[PDB]
């Protein structure tokens, strides 16, 4: 079996449960940002995923309709969706917009909401309508319909609320927190773009076309350990549809249940897996620590959003070889970058 020993770990919040929704991008983004609030001495927070998920879907439907169905309308998203959301829509506390509250449950189940909204967006974006209807204020009626259905299944967004003695608006609550999206950068490592440049990752959930800095694979992994050792956490978006990532919580990349010698990939081998569909933008998580196994092979400690009903109560151990091979992109505070890597990027 596996016996792990923590080398260094940073403060995180309680593990949440996305349940039946493709909202891992928002649950992991807020797990990362909540660790940022603890790190900045602002206390522990429980930010509402459903608030940003609601507003993001409204924007994605607009993107799908404007591109006549080119932008797919689905439950997925990115870390930039939350970074854009906090500046554009703001933030609200979890209690204001609770998951499943509208269908008498406590966890998310968006299968029926998707079934209706997918059909609605497709009827507009991929239909034969030649003129979309609007009211006397030039407001689109289909946007009202899509927003109304989303509110019935996710809830009504509050315009004002009281939280811990203070009355807030979604934007003033975001300013209350003091986070700012300008202080966070997205990082990747691929060869179909020049190094030390910015490009938007060609993945379906990046319909906002958020940019990422391109780093060499070895310098890319240097940011991982530097972020943990400096007191930072990592928003980790990676492929988890591999034989090495199991249910138990161990994500390894063995060289073909126990520690085995791992296969350390080249920059070209990593590129081919991204080129041949073997590495896809599947899951978003948070890396908050480093650990070792019995044989000394390294691991990153990962906080998932699948509840606490696992061997390590919702904490997974991803080997450094697995992270080097299957990572799609990461988001960390710019200050977590090493000074040399940070100068190379033109920050």
Ligand X SMILES: C#CC[C@H](NC(=O)CN)C(C)=O
Catalytic residues: 24, 283, 304
Question: β-pairing, 250-251 with 161-163?
Answer: unpaired
Using rule CB under 6 A, residue 304 touches ligand X: no
Interatomic CA distance for residues 20 and 99, integer angstroms: 11
DSSP code of 247? Answer: T
CB of 120 to K ion, least distance (A): 23
Site string for ligand X, 176-215 (x = CB under 6 A): -----------------------------x----------
Which of the residues 53 through 82 are near a second copy (CB under 8 A)? 63, 66-68, 70-72
Question: β-pairing, 184-188 with 327-333?
Answer: antiparallel
Question: β-pairing, 5-9 with 283-292?
Answer: antiparallel
Using rule CB under 8 A, residue 243 touches a second copy: no
Using rule CB under 6 A, residue 279 touches ligand X: no
Q: Enumerate binding residues for K ion (CB under 5 A).
A: 30, 46, 94, 239, 241, 278
207: closest CA among 88, 32, 72?
Answer: 72
The binder of a second copy chosen from 8, 46, 95, 144 (CB under 8 A): 144
User: From ligand X, a second copy, K ion, none, which one binds at residue 71 (CB under 5 to 8 Å depending on kind)?
Assistant: a second copy
Q: Which stretch binds a second copy (CB under 8 A): 21-29, 195-203, 214-222, 254-262?
A: 195-203
Which of the residues 281 through 300 are near ligand X (CB under 6 A)? 281-284
Indicate the residue among 291 and 328 with the shorter CB distance to ligand X. Answer: 328
Q: Is the separation of the CB atoms in 344 and 278 below 8 Å?
A: no
CB of 84 to ligand X, least distance (A): 15
Interatomic CA distance for residues 206 and 213, integer angstroms: 15
Using rule CB under 6 A, residue 22 touches ligand X: yes
Q: Distance from CA of residue 239 to its chain's centroid? A: 12
Indicate the residue among 137 and 276 with the shorter CB distance to ligand X. Answer: 276
* Largest Cα–Cα separation, the chain: 70
Residue 141 CB partners (closer than 8 Å, separation 6+): 132, 133, 134, 135
Interatomic CA distance for residues 28 and 305, integer angstroms: 7
CB of 28 to K ion, least distance (A): 10
Question: In whole angstroms, how far apart are CA 297 and each of 5, 129, 231?
Answer: 11, 59, 22
Residue 211 CB partners (closer than 8 Å, separation 6+): 186, 198, 199, 200
Interface residues toward ligand X, by CB under 6 A: 22-25, 74-77, 205, 237, 281-284
Interface residues toward a second copy, by CB under 8 A: 63, 66-68, 70-72, 102-104, 109, 111-112, 115-116, 118-120, 122-124, 127, 129-136, 138, 140-142, 144-145, 148-149, 152-153, 200, 202-204, 207, 209, 268-269, 271-272, 275-278, 309
């Amino acid at each position: 079996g596996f016996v792990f020993t923590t080398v260094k770990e940073n403060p995180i919040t309680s593990v949440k449960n996305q349940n039946r929704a493709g909202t891992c991008w928002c649950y992991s983004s807020y797990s990362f940002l909540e660790s940022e609030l603890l790190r900045m001495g602002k206390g522990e927070y429980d930010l509402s995923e459903m608030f940003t998920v609601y507003n993001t879907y409204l924007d994605r439907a607009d993107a799908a309709v404007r591109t006549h169905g080119d932008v797919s309308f689905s439950q997925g998203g990115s870390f930039y969706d939350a970074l854009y959301g906090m500046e554009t829509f703001g933030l609200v506390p979890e209690e204001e917009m609770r998951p499943g509250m509208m269908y008498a449950d406590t966890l998310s189940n968006h299968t029926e909401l998707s079934a209706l909204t997918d059909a609605m967006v497709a009827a507009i974006a991929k239909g034969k309508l030649r003129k979309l209807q609007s009211d006397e204020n030039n407001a689109m009626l289909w946007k009202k319909a899509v927003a109304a259905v989303h509110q019935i299944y996710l809830g009504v967004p509050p315009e004002k609320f009281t939280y811990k003695g203070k009355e807030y608006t979604p934007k003033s609550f975001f300013e209350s927190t003091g986070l700012k999206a300008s202080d966070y950068v997205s990082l990747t490592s691929y060869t179909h773009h020049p190094f030390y440049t910015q490009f938007p990752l060609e993945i379906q959930d990046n319909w906002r076309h958020g940019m990422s800095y391109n780093l060499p694979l070895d310098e890319f992994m240097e940011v991982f350990d530097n972020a943990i050792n400096t007191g930072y956490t990592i928003a980790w978006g990676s492929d988890v549809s591999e034989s090495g990532f199991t249910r138990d919580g161990v994500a390894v990349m063995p060289d073909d249940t126990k520690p085995q010698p791992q296969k350390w990939c080249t920059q070209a081998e990593r590129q081919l897996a991204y080129d041949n569909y073997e590495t896809t933008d599947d899951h978003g998580m948070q890396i908050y620590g480093i650990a070792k196994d019995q044989e000394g092979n390294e691991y990153y400690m990962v906080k998932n959003s699948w509840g606490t009903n696992s061997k390590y109560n919702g904490i997974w151990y991803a080997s450094k070889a697995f992270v080097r091979y299957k990572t799609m992109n990461i988001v960390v505070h710019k200050d977590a970058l090493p000074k040399a890597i940070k100068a190379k990027l033109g920050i």
